[PDB]
């Protein structure tokens, strides 16, 4: 009842100007079918066309909501409509796809990659797709992409459609007040959409009733602050597939905007996207375009669009005014949609490169960060890479760990006592059985009991855990008097001389196998680290089986123990193939970082039969 009481509508009551056809009025409807103010004299009244649409036919059955709103309504009430009535959360990102209204076909793998990226980026950020609504041209390709999404994957992409009300087929089929109306499958509305913002200017069978309202709604949502509350709004991409003359001026309006909206076009579809491609590669320094490529652009505009010399001249002038902001324009030339919106979010945030690195950490995209954030010519603040190092471990971003090691970060200068302590008390990442282990060793050391929830698990308690898990006459470097003295006097002396050993231990205690395999390659005493990791993983497997925990944890810990044992065996094979005597000295030299032990003793204590 709130939708009719808040949102208005307008209906064609005019003097019926015939113009060309006597039946066709200024609004194009039939002359006897009646019942802006200029020549249409339209009147305002509450709506009676809203509710739910049940898409009958066309593959999967999808219920898509709808409402008919006047074209001159303020976007604030519409934003309140999406946030309250249909129960849609505020997005992290907006999508705005435009294109040609005519139907077309593209390359098949171009369509497939376009569709797969347009689905996948919409899942990973939870963005809202803004289309042209009706099932024509590019929006039909969004519908096919969403059909493949319904056939293969499990998300519910909010894929908001904005179309004129006058052009949709079976207008009487969608008349009701909060009533589910069946719809069969002027042009048909797209079947695989989620909600509809069908806008009526009074006219029927005419476009232009939706562009200004969609533009104002995109501006109004772009002024809304994102939930990070750092001082930025949500970013907006401008997606172009092919298009015509109007999308050139849409691109110009998006570039000449405060704040600027970056636009990415694609290649292979043809027409306007191809002439942006031909302008973009053949550009030199932005607007400095030479004499051969200007008339090449003019003849391709006059050939592909079939316009005159002067019409091509104004389109080239608008193209040059668009290009003058070159840096927001990027082209996906064949040989995707994901990279477009990820780049657009990076330059719509317009923040520093630590913020870009943290956002790529959030999206788990190592290739995007490598191609864009870590390109040549990127300035870096002092100490921001170390914070990104910490944020990339608390989360299992081994690939981002590999990237950051390859781009200048050293483990010797980063790992401190306090940083490894904060690594040991993280709450992110996968689950682990470490809390049960420290609870058991504090119960054994001080017979108390259950640890407090706000407990800072000290490295001395970690060392006691390595004591209970190793067994025998082991004595870890944490529990020795030197480390306890330094811990009492502090809570390059606090830096670890051998940090990858501690990274091994923290990766083993918390069941992060991929970082353990990465940290086995980097650093030294790989045989000792592999045998210690094998004994540790076997002992946490036995401890997890002893304390009636989940058996899958015990099976995966046994698998990790067998992987580390196989690594130790194959390392022994390589050492035997290279040099026998140096392999003997590898097998017998005393391990100062592992309680003065021997690799042979560690293999026997791990019960490793193949070694």
């Amino acid at each position: 009842s709130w939708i009719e009481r808040a949102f208005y509508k307008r209906e064609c009551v005019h003097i019926i100007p015939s113009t060309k056809d006597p039946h066709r009025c200024c609004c194009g409807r039939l002359i006897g079918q009646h019942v802006w103010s200029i020549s249409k004299h339209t009147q305002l009244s509450p709506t009676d066309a809203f509710g739910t649409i049940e898409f009958q036919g066309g593959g999967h059955s999808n219920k898509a909501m709808y409402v008919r709103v006047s074209f001159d309504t303020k976007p604030d009430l519409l934003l309140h409509l999406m946030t309250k009535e249909w129960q849609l959360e505020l997005p992290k990102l907006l999508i705005s796809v435009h294109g040609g209204l005519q139907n077309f076909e593209l390359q098949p793998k171009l369509k497939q990659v376009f569709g797969k990226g347009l689905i996948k980026a919409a899942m990973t950020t939870g963005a809202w797709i803004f289309t042209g609504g009706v099932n024509t041209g590019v929006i039909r390709h969004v519908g096919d992409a969403l059909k493949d999404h319904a056939s293969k994957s499990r998300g519910k992409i909010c894929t908001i459609g904005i179309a004129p009300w006058g052009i949709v087929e079976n207008q009487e089929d969608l008349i009701g007040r909060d009533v589910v109306r069946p719809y069969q499958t002027l042009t048909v509305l797209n079947s695989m959409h989620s909600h509809f913002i069908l806008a009526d200017n009074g006219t029927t069978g005419k476009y232009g009733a939706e562009v200004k309202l969609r533009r104002q709604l995109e501006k109004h949502i772009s002024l809304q602050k994102i939930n990070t509350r750092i001082g930025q709004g949500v970013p907006v991409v401008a997606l172009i597939v092919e298009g015509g003359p109007n999308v050139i001026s849409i691109v110009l309006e998006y570039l000449r905007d405060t704040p600027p909206v970056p636009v990415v076009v694609c290649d292979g579809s043809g027409r306007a996207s191809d002439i942006l491609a031909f302008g973009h590669k053949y550009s030199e320094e932005g607007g400095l375009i030479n004499e051969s490529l200007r008339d090449q652009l003019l003849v391709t505009i006059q050939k592909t669009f079939t316009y005159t010399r002067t019409q091509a001249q104004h389109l080239f002038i608008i193209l040059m005014e668009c290009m003058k902001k070159k840096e927001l324009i990027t082209v996906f030339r064949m040989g995707d949609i994901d990279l477009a919106i990820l780049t657009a979010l990076l330059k719509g945030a317009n923040a520093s490169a630590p913020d870009q690195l943290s956002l790529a950490l959030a999206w788990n995209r190592v290739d995007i960060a490598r191609s864009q954030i870590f390109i040549y010519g990127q300035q870096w603040p002092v100490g921001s890479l170390e914070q990104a190092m910490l944020d990339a471990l608390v989360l299992d971003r081994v690939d981002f760990v590999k990237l950051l090691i390859e781009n200048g970060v050293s483990m010797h200068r980063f790992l401190t006592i306090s940083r490894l302590e904060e690594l040991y008390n993280t709450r992110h990442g996968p689950s682990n059985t470490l809390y049960h282990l420290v609870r058991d060793v504090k119960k054994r050391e001080y017979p108390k009991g259950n640890l407090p929830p706000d407990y800072r698990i000290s490295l001395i308690d970690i060392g006691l855990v390595i004591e209970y898990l190793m067994g025998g006459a082991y004595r870890c470097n944490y529990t020795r008097k030197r480390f306890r003295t330094l811990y009492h006097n502090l809570f390059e002396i606090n830096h670890f001389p051998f940090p990858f050993h501690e990274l091994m231990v923290w990766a083993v205690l918390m069941k992060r196998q991929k970082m353990a395999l990465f940290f086995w390659q980097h650093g030294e005493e790989a045989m000792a680290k592999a045998l210690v990791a094998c004994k540790l993983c076997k002992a946490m497997a036995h401890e997890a089986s002893e304390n009636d925990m989940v058996d899958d944890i015990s099976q995966e810990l046994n698998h990790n123990s067998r992987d580390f044992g196989q690594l130790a065996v194959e390392l022994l094979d390589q050492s035997y193939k290279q040099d026998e005597q140096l392999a003997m000295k590898l097998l017998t030299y005393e391990l100062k970082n592992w309680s003065n032990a021997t690799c042979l003793q560690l293999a026997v204590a791990a019960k490793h039969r193949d070694f």
């Binding site: 051969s292 008339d295 090449q296 003849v299 391709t300």
Partner: peptide, 22 residues
């Protein structure tokens, strides 16, 4: 073959420019 496709684009654009000269 990618070297073929890059230089066939240059030859086709040059042929369209020569046809515009005619």
């Amino acid at each position: 073959l990618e070297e073929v496709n890059e230089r066939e684009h240059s030859m086709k654009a040059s042929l369209q420019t020569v046809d515009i000269r005619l």
